[PDB]
A paper describes a structure:
The nicotinamide adenine dinucleotide phosphate (NADPH) dehydrogenase (NDH) complex is crucial for photosynthetic cyclic electron flow and respiration, transferring electrons from ferredoxin to plastoquinone while transporting H+ across the chloroplast membrane. In flowering plants, NDH forms a supercomplex with photosystem I, enhancing its stability under high light. In the thylakoid membranes of plants and cyanobacterial chloroplasts, NADPH dehydrogenase (NDH) is homologous to the mitochondrial NADH:ubiquinone (Q) oxidoreductase (complex I). Unlike complex I, NDH lacks an NADH oxidation (N) center and uses ferredoxin (Fd) as the electron donor instead.
Here, we present the structure of the NDH–PSI–LHCI supercomplex from Spinacia oleracea at 3–3.3-Å resolution. The supercomplex consists of 41 protein subunits, 154 chlorophylls and 38 carotenoids. We modeled a total of 46 lipids into distinct densities in the spinach supercomplex map, of which 23 are in the NDH membrane arm and 23 are in PSI–LHCI-2. The peripheral arm of plant NDH binds three iron–sulfur clusters precisely spaced for efficient electron transfer. In addition to the subunits found in cyanobacterial NDH, we discovered a previously unresolved subunit that we identified on the basis of its resolved side-chain sequence as NdhU of the SubE module. NdhU is centrally placed in the SubE module, establishing electrostatic interactions and salt bridges with subunits NdhI, NdhH, NdhK and NdhJ on the stromal side and potentially with NdhA on the lumenal side. In the spinach supercomplex, Lhca6, NdhF and PnsB5 stabilize the connection between NDH and PSI–LHCI-2. The peripheral redox arm of NDH is well resolved and contains a density near the entry of the PQ cavity that fits a bound PQ molecule. The PQ sits at the entrance of the cavity surrounded by several charged residues, interacting with Y259 of NdhA through its carbonyl group. The PQ head group is directed toward the N2 Fe–S cluster at an approximate distance of ~24 Å, too far for direct electron transfer.
Author numbering:
A (entry chain B): 20 to 507
B (entry chain 0): 77 to 232, 248
C (entry chain 8): 89 to 231
D (entry chain 6): 74 to 198
E (entry chain C): 5 to 119
F (entry chain A): 66 to 265
G (entry chain E): 1 to 100
H (entry chain G): 1 to 176
Amino acid sequence: KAFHLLLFDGSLIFPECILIFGLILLLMIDSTSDQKDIPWLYFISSTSLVMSITALLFRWREEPMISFSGNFQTNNFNEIFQFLILLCSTLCIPLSVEYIECTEMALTEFLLFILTATLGGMFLCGANDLITIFVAPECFSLCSYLLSGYTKKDVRSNEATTKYLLMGGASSSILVHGFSWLYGSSGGEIELQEIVNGLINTQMYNSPGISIALIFITVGIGFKLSPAPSHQWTPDVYEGSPTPVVAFLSVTSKVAASASATRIFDIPFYFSSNEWHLLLEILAILSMILGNLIAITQTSMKRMLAYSSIGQIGYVIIGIIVGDSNDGYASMITYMLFYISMNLGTFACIVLFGLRTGTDNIRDYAGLYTKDPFLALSLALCLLSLGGLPPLAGFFGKIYLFWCGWQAGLYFLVLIGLLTSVLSIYYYLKIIKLLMTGRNQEITPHVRNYRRSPLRSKNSIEFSMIVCVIASTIPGISMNPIITIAQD
Amino acid sequence: KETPERYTAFVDKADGYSYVYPSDWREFDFRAHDSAFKDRYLQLQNVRLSFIPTDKNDVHDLGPMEDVIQTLVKNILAAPNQMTDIREIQERSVDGKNYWTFEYNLTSPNFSVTHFTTLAIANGRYYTLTVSANERRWKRYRNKLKVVADSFKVFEI
Amino acid sequence: LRVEYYATTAEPSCELNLVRSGLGYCDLVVGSGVPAPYNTLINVHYTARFSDETVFDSSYKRGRPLTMRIGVGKVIKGLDQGIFGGDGVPPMQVGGKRKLRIPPHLGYGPEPAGCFSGDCNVPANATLLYDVTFMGVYSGNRA
Amino acid sequence: EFKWGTRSFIWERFFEPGLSPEDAVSRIKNTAEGLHSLRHMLETMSWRYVIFYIRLKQAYLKQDMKSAMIMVPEGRRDDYSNAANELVDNMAEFDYYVRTPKVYESYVSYEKTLKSIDNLLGFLA
Amino acid sequence: YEYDIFWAFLIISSVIPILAFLFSGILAPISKGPEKLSSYESGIEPMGDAWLQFRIRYYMFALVFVVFDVETVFLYPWAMSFDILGVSVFIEALIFVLILIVGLVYAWRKGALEW
Amino acid sequence: PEYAGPLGILQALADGTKLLFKENLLPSRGDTYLFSIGPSIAVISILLGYLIIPFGSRLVLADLSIGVFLWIAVSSIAPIGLLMSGYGSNNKYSFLGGLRAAAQSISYEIPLTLCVLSISLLSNSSSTVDIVEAQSKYGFWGWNLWRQPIGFIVFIISSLAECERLPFDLPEAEEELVAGYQTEYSGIKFGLFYVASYLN
Amino acid sequence: MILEHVLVLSAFLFSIGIYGLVTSRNLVRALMCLELILNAVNLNFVTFSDFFDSRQLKGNIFSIFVIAIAAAEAAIGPAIVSSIYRNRKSIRINQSNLLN
Amino acid sequence: MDLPGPIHDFLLVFLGSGLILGALGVVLFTNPIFSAFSLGLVLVCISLFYILANSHFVASAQLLIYVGAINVLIIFSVMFMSGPEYDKKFQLWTVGDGVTSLVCISLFVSLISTILNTSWYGIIWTTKSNQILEQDLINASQQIGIHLSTDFFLPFELISIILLVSLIGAIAVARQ
C-alpha cells in the first residue's frame, strides 16, 4: 500500500503522538529498570508536556483541516483549548510529583494516568465525529476513575471512587443513548457537520426523537461540567481525593467538556437553539445560585473549592448562551485561561499547606500569615482573584463575561451572576479572615509546628508562575482577546 | 516460464452461456449471482455472472453503446461513494451475437477495484459477466483476466 | 401538511433546462469560484418550496448556510444533480445562484417523509423547487 | 390528512381502528407506485431495503385488499378476489426471492407482482 | 438462506436437553429420602455451606483477560481486511500488538501473573 | 469392554441407557434451577460449534462467513455453565471444580483465539470452507501445519485445555476433588456433562 | 415487520438498568446495571445501523467500541471493588456516607 | 436477506420476553450470583438480537467479550461478598425503591411515547443511497474490517491506549 494517507494525517496529531511516545517510553523504562528516580520522571513528564506545546504552536498558522476521514478537526477554536489542556497538565505535574512521592506510593502510574487524561482531553477538543466524542472522554473519565482513588488506603478515597464511577457510568451512557437517538433519526450520520444535513434529508429535524437526544446530550455534558443538579458528583470526589488529581479534574475536565459542549451545541444543534438555550440558562442560573449559596457554609477547604468550581462554571456557560455573534466564545476563553491560573494557584497553596501541615479543615488555616507570610499572601491573592476582586484576573474576566451577556440582552443572567458574585465574597474572605488571626489561642497546633524550611520546592515555582499571572494579566486583557475573537 | 496460465471452461447449457476462468480458482456462491469463481487466497479477485429478464433481442437495442455503458456504470454497477472511470470499451461479434466488454475502476475512499464487464442480450436474458481484481494487483493480472472477459459466449438454450 | 410558516420574498423566474433525468435548472448567477468538488463539505443557502409555491424549508430560517458532503449521495438525487452536476448539468461554482425543479422520482418518491405524531413534513409524489446558492467550500475558520 | 403511515408501524397495526375502503383504495394506489419505484433498488442488489419494503407493503395489502372489497361491485367481487389472491401469491414468490436472494427470480417475481397489482387497480378503478 | 439453518440448529440443540430431562422424568423412578438428599462430603457430615473466598492476588489474571479479549476481538476485522488494503493496516495493527505486548510485560513484571 | 455386545460395541449405549434409567437426584441444600441449567448450557454451547464444520466442499450445515469466530464465541459460554453447576450443587468439591474450570478457560481462551486468528490471516477469510480450499490450492504442502507449526502446537495445547482433557483435567480431577463439578450430579445430567466433554 | 419493537425493548432495558442503578445495595450489581444500560444503547445502535446504515456499518462499529468501553469499565471495577473490600470489608454502598 | 416474516416476528417477541425476564432477574435478585446469571441470559438474548438484525460479527464480539466479563463478575462477586446466602432471595422493598420505580416508569413512558409516535419506516425510504452496498464486498465482516481499518483510525488506537491504561490501573488498584 502507501501508508501515506495516514502518514500525512498522522502529522496533524503530532502533539498527541509526542504524548503517546512519552507515555510509552516512561512505561517501558518503569518496566525495564527496578530502581525508581524522581528527577527522571519529572524530566520525562515535563519534556512530554513542553514538546506538545512546542509542536502545537508550530501548527497554529496551518490551514484548518478534517483528517482521519471525518474524525479529527484542526482549526483555531480547538487549538486554544488543546493549549489550555497542555498548560493545565504542565502546571499540575509539579503539584503531583511531590504529593504522590510524600504518600510513599508509585508515581509512574500517576504520571501515566495524568498523561493519558491529557491525551484524552486533547482529542476531545477536536473530535469531529460521534464515536470519538465518546471514546476520547472515555480516555479521560476512566483515568479519572483510576485517579481520585489512587490513594487506595484512605476510607474517603474508596467512597469517592465509588461515587465517581457510579455517577459517571450514569452519565456517559445517557450521553451515548442521546448519541444513538441522534444517529438514528438522522440517516446514519455521525460526523459533526453532517447530521443537520442528514436531519433535513430525512426531514426529522422537528421529530420528538431529536428532543430526547438534545436532553440526553446536555445532561451527559452537564455532568462533566457540573452545573445545576448534575453537580452532586463534584464535592464528595473533591473532598475525598488527593489534591493534585482533584486540581487536574478541576481545570482539565472543564476545559475539555466546555470544548465538547461548544462543538456539540453549535455545529450539530444550531437548528434547535431555542431549546438548548433554555436548558443552558436553567443549568447556569441553578449552578451559580446553588454553588455560591452552599459554599458559604463549608468547613472543608477542598469541598468549598468544589462548590466554588460549580459556581464559576455558570459564569462560563453564559459565553455559550450568548453565542458567537456578541463575542461569546471569545469570553469562554480569556476567562477559562484566567480560571486555570486562579484554581491551580489556590490548589498549589492548599497542596503545600497540607503537606507541611497535614490537614484540610478551614479552621486550621488560622495564623498562617505569622508562620508563612508568602504562602498566606499567595493564597489570599488566588482567593481574591476567585471572588472577582478588582485588581485581579477574576474581576476583568467577569466584566468581560457580563459585557457580552448585556450586549445579547440577557439581563436576568447577568443580574444573577452579579448577585452570586456578591455572595461569592463572604467565602474567599472567610479564609483570609482566618489567615489574619493573631490570636494565639485560636491558632490550631497544626500550624504552630509548621516548618517552612530553607528550600524552594517545585510547587513554589509552579505557583509563582501563577500568582504573578492572576495579578499581572489585568493589564494584558487586550493581548488575550485578539487571539480569541480571531477564532470562529 | 512455461506455457501460460491454464484455464478451465465453465459451460451452463441450461442457462445457455459459457466462459473460461483460471484453473487455480475455486467455485463459490456469490450472493444472488448465477455462477461465480474466485481465487483461493487473494480477495476481490473473482468472476461472477447473473442475468436479468429482458425483452430486447440484442445489446444494440439498449441504445448508444457509450451512453448506456456510462449510465450502467454510474447508476447500477457502483455504490454512490465510489468514483468511477472507464478506461477501455470494446465490441465483439460472433455468430450474429454482440458482446460489449468495458474496463472500469471503482475507487472508493477505502479501497479501489478494477473490473472487466461483458454485457450480452440473448435468450430473453441480459448477462453481466464481471471479472474483478484489486487495483494494486491489477497491472499484473489484467491480461490474465482479459482472456476471461474475451471468453464470454452466449448460445441458444 | 406540517409546513412551518416562513415569510420570504420570491426569486426571479427562469426558463427551465430540462435534462434526461427530469431535473430542470437555470443559472440565475454563474459563480466565479471553484466548482463543487467531489466528496467535499460545502455550505449552500437554499429555499425549498413545494408545488403551488409554498415554502416548507429554508437555510435562512436557521440563520446559517447548510453544510453537506456533496457528490456522494447524502442528499436527494435532484439536489445532488443540481449542485454537483453531471448528466447534462454543469457543476455549480462558488457564489452561483441556481433554481431547481426536482420531480417526485428524483426527490422523496411516492413515500411521505418526516412522518410523526399524525402528520408528515413532505407529502407523497411532490415536485420540489430549490433556490440554491453555493455560498462556498467548508472551512474551519470564518473571517 | 395522510390517513396512514404517520406514526410507528406497530401503533397503527395494533392500536388503530383501521382504514375505510375509500382510504384503502388510495393505499392500494400508493403501494403500486412504491412497487413501481422499487425497480432501481432492485437493480442495485440492495436486498435489505427491498425486503423491508416488501414486508411493509404486504402488511398494508392484507388489510387494504380485504377492506376494499366493498367498493368492488357484486358482478366482479369474486374475480377481483381471485386477482387479490394472485397478487398475494406473486408477492410471496417475491418474498421467497429476496430473502435467499436471487437476481433473475426476484426480477421475474417483481414483474409478476407489478402486473398483478396493475390488474388489481384495474378491478378497483 | 445461510442463517435459518442456524436458528433451526439452535432450537434443536436447546430442545435436546429438554427431551433428555423429560425422558429421564418419565423413565427413571423417584425414591427420595432425607439421607439421600444430604450434600456429599466424603461420608462425614458437611460443615458450613461451601464458600471459599480466594485471595485477590490469585485471581488478578481475570482483569488482564478482560482487556486481552477486547484486543483479540479488535484484531480480527483488521485481519479480515489485511489483503484488500496494504501496509497501512499493517502499520495500524502493529501499534495494537505492541501495546498488547507492553501490557503483558507490565502484568508479568508487576506480579499480577504470579501464583 | 467385551461382554456388552460383540466387542464392547454396545458398552457406551448401555451406559447411556443406564443413565437414562438412573434416578435423577437433586440437591436439597442447593439451587435446583442452576443445577438443571448448567449442563444444558454447556452441551448447547458445545453443540453449536458443529454448524460450521465442513466434511466436504458443500457438506456443511451453514457456511457462515463469520466462521471460526462464532465457534470461539459459542465455546466461551460452556464455562459459565460449569460455574453454574459448581455453585448450584452447594458442595465444596463442586465449588472448587467450577472455579478451576473458570480459571482454565480464562487462561486458555486467548492463545487459541490468536492461533485461529493467524490461520484466518493466512487464508484471508474466517469461513472454514475458504480455509480448507486455501490449503487445497497447493495440495499436501499447502496445509497450514507446515506453514504454521508454532500455532499448530499452541492450538493443540489450548484445545486440550479447553476440552479439559489430561494433563488439563483440573476442574474434574478425580484424585483431588471427588468428581469436581460433577460431584453431586446423578442420572442424565452426568451423561450430559459427559457427552459435552466428548463432543468438545 | 415489527422491528420497531426492538427499540421498545431497548428503552425498557435502559429504564430497568436505570432502576437497577439506583436501588443497588451492592456495587457489583450497580456495575451490572451499568452494563445493562450500555447494552440498551448498543441495541439501539445496532438496530439503527440495520435500518439506515447497511453499507457503512457505523452503528456496528460504534457498538464494538461501546462494548470495548464497557469491558474497560468492568476491568477498572471490580478492581476498585477489590480496594474497597480490602480497606473496609463491606460492599454496601449506601452504608458509606462519610463524605456528606 | 432475512428470515421468513412470521418467524422473524415470533423470534422478536420470544427474545424480547427472555430479555425482559433476564433484566427483571437482574434488578430483583439479592444474590449478585443469581443476578449475574440473569445478566448472562440478557447477554445471550442481545447477541441473538444482533444475529437477527444483520450483525453476525457484533453478536460474536458481544458473546466473547461479555461472557468474559460475566465470568470475571461472578468470580469477583464470589470473592467479594459474604456467605453463599441462598436465603437472601429477592431483597426487601422500601419507599426509596417505590419512588424510583415511579420515576423510571415515567422515563420509560416518555421514551415509548416517542418510539410509538415516530414512523421509523419513513426514515428508511429517505436513506436510500446509504443502503447501496459495494458489490465486491460480499462478506459483511469484510466490510466491517475495511471500515474499522480506514474510516475509524483515531478511535482504533485510542481504544488501545484506553485498554492498556485500564489494565495498568486494574493491576495497580487491586494489588494487595
